Amino acid sequence: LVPVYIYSPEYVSMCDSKIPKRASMVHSLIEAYALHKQMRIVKPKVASMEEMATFHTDAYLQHLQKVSDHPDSIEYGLGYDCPATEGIFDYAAAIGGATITAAQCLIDGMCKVAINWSGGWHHAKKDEASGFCYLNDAVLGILRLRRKFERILYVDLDLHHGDGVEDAFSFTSKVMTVSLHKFSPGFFPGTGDVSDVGLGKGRYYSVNVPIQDGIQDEKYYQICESVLKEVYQAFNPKAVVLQLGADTIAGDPMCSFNMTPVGIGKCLKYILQWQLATLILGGAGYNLANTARCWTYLTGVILGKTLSSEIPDHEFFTAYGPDYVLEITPSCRPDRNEPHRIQQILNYIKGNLKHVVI
Numbered sequence: 001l002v003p004v005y006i007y008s009p010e011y012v013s014m015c016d017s018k019i020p021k022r023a024s025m026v027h028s029l030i031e032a033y034a035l036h037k038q039m040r041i042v043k044p045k046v047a048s049m050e051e052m053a054t055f056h057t058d059a060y061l062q063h064l065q066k067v068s069d070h071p072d073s074i075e076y077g078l079g080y081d082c083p084a085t086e087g088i089f090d091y092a093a094a095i096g097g098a099t100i101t102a103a104q105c106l107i108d109g110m111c112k113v114a115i116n117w118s119g120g121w122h123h124a125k126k127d128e129a130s131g132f133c134y135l136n137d138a139v140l141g142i143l144r145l146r147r148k149f150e151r152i153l154y155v156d157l158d159l160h161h162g163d164g165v166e167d168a169f170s171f172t173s174k175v176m177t178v179s180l181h182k183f184s185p186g187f188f189p190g191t192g193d194v195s196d197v198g199l200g201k202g203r204y205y206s207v208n209v210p211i212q213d214g215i216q217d218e219k220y221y222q223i224c225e226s227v228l229k230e231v232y233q234a235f236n237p238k239a240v241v242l243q244l245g246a247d248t249i250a251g252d253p254m255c256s257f258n259m260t261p262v263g264i265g266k267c268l269k270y271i272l273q274w275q276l277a278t279l280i281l282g283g284a285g286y287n288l289a290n291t292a293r294c295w296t297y298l299t300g301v302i303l304g305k306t307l308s309s310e311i312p313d314h315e316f317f318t319a320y321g322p323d324y325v326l327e328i329t330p331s332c333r334p335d336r337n338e339p340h341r342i343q344q345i346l347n348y349i350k351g352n353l354k355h356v357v358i
């Protein structure tokens, strides 16, 4: 019935310690619009060792636990991108447990939509941290959904390729991954061309949409809708995990895409009208107020509400200056997506999906 909102004061505090206080900012703006009163608030459980090991190796988890300049930390992806800091293991278990909790609410029929805005760390591998992701909560959520759902669709609308989730399932046809992302030689993580379709028994069950700098709402939605329409018809998913990293939004320091929350919101609406069990994740997002703006707007989308344009007073009201509105304005810079290259990509994907059964 009513969407589940994964939240506790303790969870937000844990998450608050790259994105300082971002979790507080997201939650307080959502509360400032009183959207929490229309959702079922569910305290997240901390992920157990066994739950985390549904994906990650015990060697990696014990190392993460142990360092939470160790000679083995380079081997496990900890360092330049993923600093070893105290309590990072408790932080990871909290995020992983929160997404698992959301997945369990979906399995139990408590809701059709469960939200963990602090999840979405799509780069972590079974045995290695990557791209500021210590634990892959999306994979953990998908593996939990697999207890019930025979076909799971993962949609990744983060600026970056969801490589960790794709690689985790690249050999299976039970989970289809779809990532829209900037793809450009030199741009992290460097994978996810349209020719990347998965491996072995999973061949054609990964979909990658490489997009160039400067794309705005209308063309982004056209791409997303056409891919997801073809995907829905070909795969007939029974559950969806949706990653909504806001580093695509105009004003992010990544300064790559030029999206607003309204355009992401149309993609979200298209997925929601499927009326499937849907697990909503956040992810990256480096302009903190814009990320709160985005995910607050999307929470309203989930609840079918139109939010007031004026940022309501709350703890972080001043971060929304000097104009204090919810809307985000695209930057005045070129869209580098050639329409015929985009259509070539769509044709390639359509052909790939003709091989997908059931």
Ligand SMILES: CN(C)c1ccc(C(=O)NCCCCCCC(=O)NO)cc1
Pocket (backbone or CB within 6 Å): 081, 123, 131, 132, 158, 159, 160, 188, 245, 247, 283, 284, 285
């Ligand atoms: C100014 N400064 C200190 C930095 C700027 C950029 C990066 C970076 O992109 N590094 C490569 C790793 C990018 C991982 C992207 C994480 C993400 O948003 N995934 O969705 C690093 C430092």
Ligand SMILES: [K+]
Pocket (backbone or CB within 6 Å): 156, 157, 158, 159, 160, 161, 162, 179, 180, 181
């Ligand atoms: K993506």
Ligand SMILES: [K+]
Pocket (backbone or CB within 6 Å): 169, 170, 171, 172, 173, 174, 175, 176, 177, 198, 202, 205, 206
């Ligand atoms: K797959």
Ligand SMILES: [Zn+2]
Pocket (backbone or CB within 6 Å): 158, 159, 160, 245, 247, 284, 285
């Ligand atoms: Zn990203």
